[PDB]
Amino acid sequence: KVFGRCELAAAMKRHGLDNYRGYSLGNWVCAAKFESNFNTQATNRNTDGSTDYGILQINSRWWCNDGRTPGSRNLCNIPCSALLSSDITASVNCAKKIVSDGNGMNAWVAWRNRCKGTDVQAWIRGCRL
Numbered sequence: 001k002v003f004g005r006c007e008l009a010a011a012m013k014r015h016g017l018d019n020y021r022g023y024s025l026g027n028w029v030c031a032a033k034f035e036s037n038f039n040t041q042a043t044n045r046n047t048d049g050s051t052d053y054g055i056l057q058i059n060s061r062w063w064c065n066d067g068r069t070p071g072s073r074n075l076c077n078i079p080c081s082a083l084l085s086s087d088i089t090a091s092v093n094c095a096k097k098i099v100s101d102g103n104g105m106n107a108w109v110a111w112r113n114r115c116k117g118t119d120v121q122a123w124i125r126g127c128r129l
């Protein structure tokens, strides 16, 4: 499923991401836009052999199991395919574990390079939340 900007903002808010660990909703919507262009089915292979899955491009090296990433961890205890669902619950729950890991949202390269330090509030403007 390809989410609309405000539709995703509402979905994330409902799942408790607004201000989660101090990150305003705009940060999460901005991260989703540049990681997957709001597409839940996005996948991207990395040079190390791991793959990123879903709306927030969660990596199979540490967070989910895809059966093809040797010596990898499954910290979110879920098959990576679950992260491609139209229902973002799995992605949100796993993202909460990731952002609490100690490096905050810096774990998402796109957020660090394209959202961090910008006016992220603009990503939820005009939305009925």
Ligand SMILES: [Cl-]
Pocket (backbone or CB within 6 Å): 021, 022, 103, 104, 105
């Ligand atoms: Cl932080």
Ligand code: NA
Pocket (backbone or CB within 6 Å): 060, 061, 062, 063, 064, 065, 066, 069, 072, 073, 074
């Ligand atoms: Na894994």
